Symmetry: C3
Subunit: 108 residues, 3 copies
């Protein structure tokens, strides 16, 4: 079973491990960040929350990619195993010789 991460922020009642996004409200102080790299401030808040979800989605795609790569590899192994197909269904018995089905009667 493949286990993916739940999104950390939702626009509605949260479930286990999630938080509700806090949109910008009127009457709230409209501020930005105080450092060249910080993300604090109400003006940035909801976008920071959406980016956190985007980071989780990126990791979930990486989990699916790894699993798909494994499937592709397993498929290639089956294709190269050299399994043999069915023999004619004509009421005659067949044996295997040189990669083909040959009539048993030919040897009796």
């Amino acid at each position: 079973d493949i286990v993916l991460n739940d999104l950390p922020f939702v626009d509605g009642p949260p479930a286990e491990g999630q938080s509700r996004i806090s949109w910008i409200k009127n009457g709230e102080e409209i501020l930005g960040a105080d450092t060249q790299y910080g993300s604090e401030g109400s003006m940035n808040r909801p976008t920071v929350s959406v980016l956190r979800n985007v980071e989780v989605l990126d990791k979930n795609i990486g989990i699916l990619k790894t699993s798909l790569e494994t499937a592709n590899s397993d498929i290639k192994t089956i294709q190269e195993a050299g399994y043999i197909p069915e023999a004619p269904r004509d009421g005659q018995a067949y044996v295997r010789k040189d990669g083909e089905w040959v009539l048993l009667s030919t040897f009796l």
Copy 2:
């Protein structure tokens, strides 16, 4: 064929079922929400649109996960089927005995 959902909001001319994102414009009233949980207001508008796309992406990943789980299960079934590999290609006829290829001549 796997059918995924198209993103609902795009930053360009929309196609069927899509809407163009409306960025914040100068000369527009800069407002937020009036409830503790609402997302109304120009200051929230473009971010709400991007979150809608994020919700759709999350569902699309869930669709791929289900399909991949089914593939993994089908692969496991093939690996456990016990298909048999090719017999030597040496000009001799072979029959099956105790999970191996044995020379027909040994019984004639």
Copy 3:
């Protein structure tokens, strides 16, 4: 091997091909766009960056979908190949007739 696109914008030190997101800063001019369809302006900047990541994620999911469709098709081909299962492991030699394993002794 499946090759996916890296996200173009990150909230931290960037790696090859990435740029650091520029959050809204205090002391910065708070502006929007001047056209009905433009996305310029500090108020839109971080959200535009997150949308660029969302567009890349959408393409990465499309890459995984194509690869999974190919796997599904390869699996279907293996299921329809008609490979044959193992014969009884009871110390007796078997030959193939009418889609079943039959005792060689029956023909000797």
